């Protein structure tokens, strides 16, 4: 019980920080770390109607 | 139940009544 | 006195009290 | 991908749709629909289901004499397990239906269609040009989700112990949990209801401020509370409205799994006792003799 | 009768939900 | 009894081994 | 794989894994990424971490 | 010196200590 | 019962390969501006 | 048990495994002593 | 002197001046009635988890001294004999006996009573606050909420039963024993107002996180608002379908629905005050009656909850003196 | 006068290192000496159930419910 | 004359709001009314 | 408000911007300071009226964005600029028509709302880059025709005013980051530079056409237009380094042995 607790715990954790990393290293490869850029955005050049 | 029925239906009715001609009035 | 070491010092004891809190939760009264 | 000069990816990832389907969307549209109209279609007329193979048919469906409250899709039978049970193993669509066989049509493709949604909240993340962690905030109700249909069955060894798609239904997978896991006195279930709870404050709380400072409120709330806010820039405060609930969720789904291997709550029965060994109550074991109750009358036999 | 009404509001929240969501 | 003061004794060595480091690297050197 | 019923199961796979890893091994450390992995993976410290 | 604060920080301070030397007198009680 | 078994292996290894194929579509993430 | 010859050394060793706990909160503690530069 | 048109300085404008002072802490004339209020509300739940007892109330033991811990520590409700009266330390009962008083369980009331005038007090505080440097005082109506929830679960329900027994003494294990009584007994979960009240929480806590997550996703690199509210509004557009369109609207959305949540809650806690409550579906019942083989789910909640009252009530109700023998304890192999 | 300042100076450490104590052993002879029980009614752990009353004690009583206790309890 | 009237304003989305408000506690409650 | 019209001669270039070819002109947006970033004359936005070319008697004096880099480019010696930037010099590289538009946006934007003020620049931004991907497609067929006809430079003027005019912060639908029309232009020039003996920047703008997602690497390995690139060494040494070999040979063969 306490294997199978701790692991699946640790392992759910680390899913999560996989998300998150992957996100972070996504945005980073593409420029998207810092935010959105101010002076123009993607959804600015996009149609209105969503 | 008619009672329960009647009741539901009003509900249903009476309100979205209300809204829609609250709409026709000003879209 | 630094306000780290002061703040190291707080956190010592707070852990300590908690460590004495638990010993008791399993000696003591409430251990069963 | 590249069908007809590649427009089918072109239509895929074009942002032009009414909703961004995207390659998760792929696979996230046509799950999520399955499980949808299997889930409908079993909510309004499905044969009623042995949740347990005692062959007692727990009915769930409203025209089998129930409600929206009461409807439910039965978990699936404990005869099946955690084995496979999809309609080509069944000898029969009508053994299929009689063994609880749609809930796990409904929590395979659904826990699926969530999976790829959080995908999609990432493709469209990154697609729209922001930093891509709505999908690391969406993974808290698809943990719990996923706790509750999937680890639960796991650690309990059969799919008629996950959460019924249904509303009473989801009131007794509840009080079975608390009466089998003591689920309340968990310090998991614990910091998850702390952090609902803290998550409608700060709602309410950001709500308030907002609306009361759009006039067109960090000396509002520096005086209101005695040791002020610490997070005066709003990206903190922001911050802080995500991580609190995501987290609570994180851990109380956290608590649902390790019980799901038996690691029940605190147990608190005889903490105190007397001078002669008398056991003295507390409000423990109060709700020790709550959880009996429900122990006993879960256990139809 | 009783679960056809109800049938019916839950097809009209649906409708209500696809409305929302296309009809702007 | 004898047993649990040498443990509390080890647990305190313990506990100061790092503040010892950081106060000495904070006074001496001024790395830290 | 929870389903292994033998020791002989799990030191033949054991065996197996280990050729496959030292292969692999020499095989990483005498190339280079196609253009499809390329062109298909993120190549930053926080990619590999995630 | 007896400001507002100083009196709000004893009033929460004081009772808190006595109550901590309390429960861990507590801790070590007897059975 | 086996028709339908085959007719979802196809749906679902359909859905899948147009899901694989589909990121192996995308364009490696980069900077234009580096 | 231990082995006899390290018998009387069983104390330490119970307070051995909790020692990955002291060294993030020397992480934190060194932080706090940078002043969270 | 100062005043509206040369009025007179008085012993009141002076007071005013001082309570209104930016000091470290914000007294204000509500300051009255809040910080004696909540602080000795405060003070009177540590005192009674840490040393008062519960064994001549609920024949329990829990408190600090008596070996209970934080979880199961509590500030047990008065005995059922005492009723609704508010144990004052000076009443007809404990008539000036802080010993006696406290273990009569008066320093529950104590408690609760101050703690409700804390509450008021803080409202008031909110009023205070907002008006000074005027903003418009929403925080005060978001507080609106938990005060009545707490009116409705702490003064009203027990006003409406027989005693302050069943109102939730403060105590994490004694409100989930509270919490365990209402499923057992009033099927509060099947309630409406209870089932709006947590649709309600749910919904504030997922707007908590999904405004915190795009707020700070939607972050601007590098007087002026910090994060896109175009690209978080075309997310949810092409993400869910729904997206706010106005921050004013979304923060004011955040704000109302925890707030009508609680309020639901607390309506629908008012109703099982007087036992009103959802309990039952009369033709599931008569279904379940004439038809053996016919179980939902709903008929398993009612059998579980039978077993709660039956096997609870012996130990959770002394004042009943119920003594069940073992052959009507309601059971699952028994049906 | 702000944190800071007040905790770094050593003036509040000289005055506050024979009170912090002082109100710790305080607490502690009252928990210890039996304080606590007589005047908070809480029962000792050797005095739970007396010798006629071996059950968990009742109040019936309303007003006269003074006596009642005084009764249930060792007194 | 009306010298303080205002016609009452009730666009796309706050229609939907209420009826969707409506028919959400329609469907809450018809299993209690009907009972 | 009479313009400067200075003068600037330098080797090579370095420590210089550009800007777009939506208003037709040339302007420095800022001094890279990795370099010589010290420029008198050009320390803002100069419309360079006038770019004389060191392979060409004469001294060219056009206006146009490509001509512009062309000669810029193409000449390696000093070579000289006539900046024409005003009195105040002032940042004017996106003419576009006025702030009026954009002001209800930046208003509405301030205010955390979407409303359509928002949506009015967003559509205006939709046509406007529609337009602007028409005109690139445009200008492509047009530099293929003159291609067809043996114009040189005229085909690597259209290539460098469609390359001027790249979508800044560019998000594709399949997740480009770059407009299609970028690679397959910037490699257009890449080979042209390399068969009109500008080996060095035909170099360059291939590393630029690679770093911006081209795959066709057999393209490159057979294309006589950039034959006279691979005479210089450093063509190999950008295909190593965006193109590396799958099995290191040399790696096998040095552990043959020892
Ligand atoms: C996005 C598409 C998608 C996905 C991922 C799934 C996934 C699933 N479905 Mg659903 N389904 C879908 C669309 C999808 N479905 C649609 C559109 C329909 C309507 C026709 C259905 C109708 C349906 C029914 C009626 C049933 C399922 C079932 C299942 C499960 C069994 C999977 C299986 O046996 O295939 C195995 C497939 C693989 C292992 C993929 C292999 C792919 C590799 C890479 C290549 C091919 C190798 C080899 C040739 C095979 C699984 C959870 C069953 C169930 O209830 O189980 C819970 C079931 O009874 N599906
Ligand atoms: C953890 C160990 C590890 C890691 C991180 C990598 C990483 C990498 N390898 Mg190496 N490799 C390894 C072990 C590893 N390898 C071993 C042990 C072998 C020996 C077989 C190889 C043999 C090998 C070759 C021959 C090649 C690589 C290549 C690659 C690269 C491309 C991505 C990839 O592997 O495909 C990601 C995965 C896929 C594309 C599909 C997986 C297909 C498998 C067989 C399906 C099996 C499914 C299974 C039945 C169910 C699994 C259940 C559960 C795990 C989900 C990447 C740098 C390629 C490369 O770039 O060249 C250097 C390449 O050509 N690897
Ligand atoms: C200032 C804040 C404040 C507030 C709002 C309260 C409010 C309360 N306290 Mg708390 N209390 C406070 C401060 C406060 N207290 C302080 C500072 C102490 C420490 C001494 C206490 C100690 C304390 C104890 C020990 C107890 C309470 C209790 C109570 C409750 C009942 C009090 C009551 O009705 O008699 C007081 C009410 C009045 C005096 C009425 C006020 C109206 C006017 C001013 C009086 C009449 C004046 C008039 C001119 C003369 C008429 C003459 C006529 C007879 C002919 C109530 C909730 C009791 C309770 O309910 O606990 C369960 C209780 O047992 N309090
Ligand atoms: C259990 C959940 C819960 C807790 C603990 C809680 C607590 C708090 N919320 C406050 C605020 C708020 N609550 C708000 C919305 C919400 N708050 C919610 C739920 C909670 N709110 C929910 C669900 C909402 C959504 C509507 C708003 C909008 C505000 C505020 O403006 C305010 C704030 O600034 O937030 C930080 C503070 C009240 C000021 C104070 O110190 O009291 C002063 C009065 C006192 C102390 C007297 C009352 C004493 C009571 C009766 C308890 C006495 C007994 C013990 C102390 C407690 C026993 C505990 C045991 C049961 C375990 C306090 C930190
Ligand atoms: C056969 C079938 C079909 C079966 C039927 C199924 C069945 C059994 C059950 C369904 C029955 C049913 C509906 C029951 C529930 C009834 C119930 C109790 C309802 C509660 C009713 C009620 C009035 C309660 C009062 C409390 C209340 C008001 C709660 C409201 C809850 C609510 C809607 C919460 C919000 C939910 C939500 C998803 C919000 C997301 C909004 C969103 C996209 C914002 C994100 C966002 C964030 C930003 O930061 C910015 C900047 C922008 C721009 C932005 O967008
Ligand atoms: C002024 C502010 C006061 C804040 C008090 C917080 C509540 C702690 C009271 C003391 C206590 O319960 O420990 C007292 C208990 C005593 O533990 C018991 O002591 C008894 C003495 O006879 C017996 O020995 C029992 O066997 C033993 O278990 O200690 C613990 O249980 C250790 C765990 C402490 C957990 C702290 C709370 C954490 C969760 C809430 C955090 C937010 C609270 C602050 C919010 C603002
Ligand atoms: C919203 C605003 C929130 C403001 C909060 C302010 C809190 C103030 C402090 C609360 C306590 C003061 C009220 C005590 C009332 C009381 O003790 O009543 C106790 C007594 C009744 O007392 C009962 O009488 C019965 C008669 O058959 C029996 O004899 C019972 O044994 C006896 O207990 O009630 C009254 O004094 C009159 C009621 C006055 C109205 C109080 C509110 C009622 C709420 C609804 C009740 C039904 C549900
Ligand atoms: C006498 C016979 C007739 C009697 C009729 C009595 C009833 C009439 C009123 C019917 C109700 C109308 C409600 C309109 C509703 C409406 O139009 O609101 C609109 C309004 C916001 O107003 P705006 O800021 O958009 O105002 C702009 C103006 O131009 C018009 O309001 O919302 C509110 O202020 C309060 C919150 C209500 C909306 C939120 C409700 C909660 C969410 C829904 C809960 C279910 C969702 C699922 C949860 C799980
Ligand atoms: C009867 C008990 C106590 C007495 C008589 C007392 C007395 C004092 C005195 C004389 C000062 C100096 C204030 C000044 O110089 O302006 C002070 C300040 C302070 N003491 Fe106490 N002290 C007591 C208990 C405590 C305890 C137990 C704590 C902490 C647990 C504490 C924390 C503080 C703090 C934070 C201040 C700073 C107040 C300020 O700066 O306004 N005190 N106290
Ligand atoms: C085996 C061995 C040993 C040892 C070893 C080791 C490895 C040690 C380590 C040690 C360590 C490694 C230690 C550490 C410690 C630490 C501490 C003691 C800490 C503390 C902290 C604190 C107290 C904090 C606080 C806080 C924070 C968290 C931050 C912010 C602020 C506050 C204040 C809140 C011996 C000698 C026995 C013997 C021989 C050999
Ligand atoms: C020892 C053992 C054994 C065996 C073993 C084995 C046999 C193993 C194998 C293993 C393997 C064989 C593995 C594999 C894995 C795989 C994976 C893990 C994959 C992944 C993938 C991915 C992740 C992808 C991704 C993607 C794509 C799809 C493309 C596009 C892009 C991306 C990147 C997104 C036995 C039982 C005998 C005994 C016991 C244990
Ligand atoms: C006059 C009067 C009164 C009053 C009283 C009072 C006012 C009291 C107060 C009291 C108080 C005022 C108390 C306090 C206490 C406190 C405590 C008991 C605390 C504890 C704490 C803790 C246990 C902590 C912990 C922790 C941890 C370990 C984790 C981390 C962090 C922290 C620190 C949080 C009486 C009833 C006599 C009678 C009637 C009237
Ligand atoms: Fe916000």
């Not at chain 4, 193993?89 to 066989?101: H, I, M, P, Q």
């Not at chain 9, 078994?5 to 364009?27: H, M, P, Q, R």
């Not at chain 14, 081209?214 to 040494?237: E, G, M, T």
């Amino acid at each position: 019980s306490w294997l199978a607790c701790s692991h699946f715990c640790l392992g759910f954790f680390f899913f999560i920080g996989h998300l998150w990393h992957a996100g972070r290293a996504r945005a980073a490869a593409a420029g998207f770390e810092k935010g959105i850029d101010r002076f123009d955005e993607p959804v600015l050049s996009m149609r209105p109607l969503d | 139940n008619i009672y329960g029925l009647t009741a539901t239906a009003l509900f249903i009715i009476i309100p979205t009544s209300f809204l829609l001609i609250l709409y026709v009035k000003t879209a | 006195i630094p306000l780290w070491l002061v703040g190291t010092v707080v956190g010592t004891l707070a852990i300590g009290l908690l460590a004495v809190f638990f010993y008791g939760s399993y000696v003591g009264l409430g251990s069963s | 991908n590249s069908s007809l000069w590649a427009r089918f990816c072109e239509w895929i990832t074009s942002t032009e749709n009414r909703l961004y389907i995207g390659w998760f969307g792929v696979i996230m549209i046509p799950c999520l629909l399955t499980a949808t109209s299997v889930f409908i279609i079993a909510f309004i007329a499905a044969p009623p289901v042995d949740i347990d193979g005692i062959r007692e048919p727990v009915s769930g469906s409203l025209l089998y004499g129930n409600n929206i409250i009461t409807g439910a899709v039965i978990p699936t039978s404990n005869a099946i397990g955690l084995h496979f049970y999809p309609i080509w193993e069944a000898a029969s669509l009508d053994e299929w239906l009689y063994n609880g066989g749609p809930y796990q049509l409904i929590v395979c493709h659904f826990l699926l269609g969530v999976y790829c949604y959080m995908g999609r909240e990432w493709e469209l993340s990154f697609r729209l040009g922001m930093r891509p962690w709505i999908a690391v905030a969406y993974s808290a109700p698809v943990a719990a989700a996923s706790a509750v249909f999937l680890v639960y069955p796991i650690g309990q060894g059969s799919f008629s112990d996950g959460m019924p798609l249904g509303i009473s239904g989801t009131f007794n997978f509840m009080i079975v949990f608390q009466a089998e896991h003591n689920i309340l006195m968990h310090p998991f279930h614990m910091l998850g209801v702390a952090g609902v709870f803290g998550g409608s404050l700060f709602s309410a709380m950001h709500g308030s401020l907002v609306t009361s400072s759009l006039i067109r409120a960090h000396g509002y709330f520096g005086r209101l509370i005695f040791q002020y806010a610490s997070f005066n820039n709003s990206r903190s405060l922001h911050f802080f409205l995500a991580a609190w609930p995501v987290i609570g969720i994180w851990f109380t789904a956290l608590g649902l799994s390790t019980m799901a291997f038996n690691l029940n709550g605190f147990n608190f029965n005889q903490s105190v006792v007397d001078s002669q060994g008398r056991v003295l109550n507390t409000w423990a074991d109060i709700i020790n003799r709550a959880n009996l109750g429900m122990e006993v009358m879960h256990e139809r036999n | 009768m009783e679960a056809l009404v109800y049938t019916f509001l839950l097809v009209g929240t649906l409708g209500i939900i696809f409305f929302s969501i296309f009809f702007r | 009894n004898i047993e649990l003061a040498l443990t509390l004794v080890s647990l305190v060595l313990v506990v100061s081994a790092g503040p010892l480091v950081v106060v000495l690297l904070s006074a001496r050197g001024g790395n830290l | 794989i929870c389903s292994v019923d033998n020791m002989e199961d799990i030191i033949g796979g054991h065996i197996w894994i280990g050729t496959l890893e030292i292969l692999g091994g020499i095989w990483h450390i005498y190339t280079t990424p196609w253009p499809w992995a390329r062109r298909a993976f993120v190549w930053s410290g926080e990619a590999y971490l995630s | 010196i007896f400001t507002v604060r100083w009196l709000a920080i004893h009033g929460i301070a004081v009772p808190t200590i006595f109550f901590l030397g309390a429960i861990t007198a507590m801790q070590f009680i007897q059975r | 019962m086996l028709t339908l078994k085959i007719f979802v292996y196809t749906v679902v290894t359909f859905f899948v390969c147009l899901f694989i194929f589909g990121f192996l579509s995308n364009d490696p993430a980069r900077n234009p501006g580096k | 048990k231990l082995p006899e010859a390290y018998a009387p050394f069983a104390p330490i060793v119970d307070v051995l495994p909790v020692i990955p706990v002291f060294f993030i909160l020397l992480a934190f503690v060194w932080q706090a002593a940078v002043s969270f530069r | 002197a100062i005043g509206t048109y040369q009025e007179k300085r008085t012993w009141f404008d002076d007071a005013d001046d001082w309570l209104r002072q930016d000091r470290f802490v914000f007294v204000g004339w509500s300051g009255l009635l809040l910080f004696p209020c909540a602080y000795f509300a405060l003070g009177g739940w540590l005192t009674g988890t840490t040393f008062v007892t519960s064994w001549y109330t609920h024949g329990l033991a829990t408190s600090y001294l008596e070996g209970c811990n934080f979880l199961t520590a509590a500030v047990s409700t008065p005995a059922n004999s005492m009723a609704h009266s508010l144990l004052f330390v000076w009443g007809p009962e404990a008539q000036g006996d802080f010993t006696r008083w406290c273990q009569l369980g008066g320093l529950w009331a104590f408690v609760a009573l101050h703690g409700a005038f804390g509450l008021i007090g803080f409202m008031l505080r909110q009023f205070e606050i907002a008006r000074s440097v005027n903003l418009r005082p929403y925080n005060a109506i978001a507080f609106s909420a938990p005060i009545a929830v707490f009116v409705s679960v702490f003064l009203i329900y027990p006003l409406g039963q027989s005693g302050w027994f069943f109102a939730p003494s403060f105590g994490v294990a004694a409100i989930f024993r509270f919490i365990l009584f209402f499923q057992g007994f009033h099927n509060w979960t099947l309630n409406p107002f209870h089932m709006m009240g947590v649709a309600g929480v749910l919904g504030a806590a997922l707007l908590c996180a999904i405004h915190g997550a795009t707020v700070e996703n939607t972050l601007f690199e590098d007087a002026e608002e910090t994060y896109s509210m175009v690209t978080a509004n075309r997310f949810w557009s092409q993400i869910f379908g729904v997206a706010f369109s106005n921050k004013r609207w979304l923060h004011f959305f955040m704000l109302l629905v925890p707030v009508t949540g609680l309020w639901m809650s607390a309506i629908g806690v008012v109703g099982l005050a007087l036992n009103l409550r959802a309990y039952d579906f009369v033709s599931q019942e008569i279904r379940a009656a004439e038809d053996p083989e016919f179980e939902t789910f709903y008929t398993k909640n009612i059998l579980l909850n039978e077993g709660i009252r039956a096997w609870m009530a012996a130990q959770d109700q002394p004042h009943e003196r119920l003594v069940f023998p073992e052959e009507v304890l309601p059971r699952g192999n028994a049906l | 006068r702000p944190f800071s300042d007040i905790l770094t100076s050593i003036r509040y450490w000289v005055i506050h290192s024979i009170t912090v104590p002082a109100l710790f052993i305080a607490g502690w002879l009252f928990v210890s000496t039996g304080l606590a029980y007589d005047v908070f009614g809480t029962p000792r752990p050797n005095e739970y159930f007396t010798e006629d009353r071996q059950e968990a004690p009742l109040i019936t009583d309303r007003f006269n419910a003074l006596e009642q206790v005084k009764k249930l309890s060792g007194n | 004359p009306n010298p303080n009237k205002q016609v009452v304003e009730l666009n796309r989305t706050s229609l939907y709001w209420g009826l969707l408000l409506i028919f959400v506690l329609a469907v809450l409650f018809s299993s209690y009314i009907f009972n | 408000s009479e313009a400067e019209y200075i003068e600037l001669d330098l080797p090579k270039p370095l420590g210089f911007k550009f800007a777009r070819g939506n208003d037709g002109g040339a302007y420095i947006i800022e001094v890279n300071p990795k370099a010589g970033n010290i420029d008198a004359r050009v320390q803002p936005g100069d419309k360079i009226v006038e770019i004389s070319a060191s392979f060409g008697s004469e001294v060219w004096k056009a206006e146009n964005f490509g001509q512009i880099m062309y000669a810029i480019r193409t000449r390696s010696g000093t070579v000289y600029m006539k900046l024409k930037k005003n009195y105040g010099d002032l940042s004017a590289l996106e003419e576009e028509g006025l702030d009026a538009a954009e002001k209800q946006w930046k208003k509405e934007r301030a205010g955390g709302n979407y409303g359509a003020g928002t949506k009015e620049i967003q559509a205006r931004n939709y046509v406007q880059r529609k337009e602007n991907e028409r005109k690139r497609r445009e200008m492509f067929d047009d530099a293929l025709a003159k291609f067809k006809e043996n114009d040189i430079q005229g085909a690597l003027v259209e290539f460098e005013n469609i390359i001027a005019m790249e979508p800044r912060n560019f998000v594709g639908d399949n997740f480009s980051r770059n407009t299609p029309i970028y690679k397959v232009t910037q490699y257009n020039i890449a080979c042209c530079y390399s068969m009109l003996d500008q080996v060095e920047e035909a170099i360059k703008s291939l590393d630029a056409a690679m770093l911006s997602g081209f795959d066709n690497y057999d393209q490159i390995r057979r294309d006589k237009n950039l034959s006279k690139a691979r005479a210089n060494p450093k063509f190999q040494a950008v295909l190593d380094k965006y193109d590396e070999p799958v099995v290191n040979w040399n790696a096998v063969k040095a552990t043959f042995g020892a």
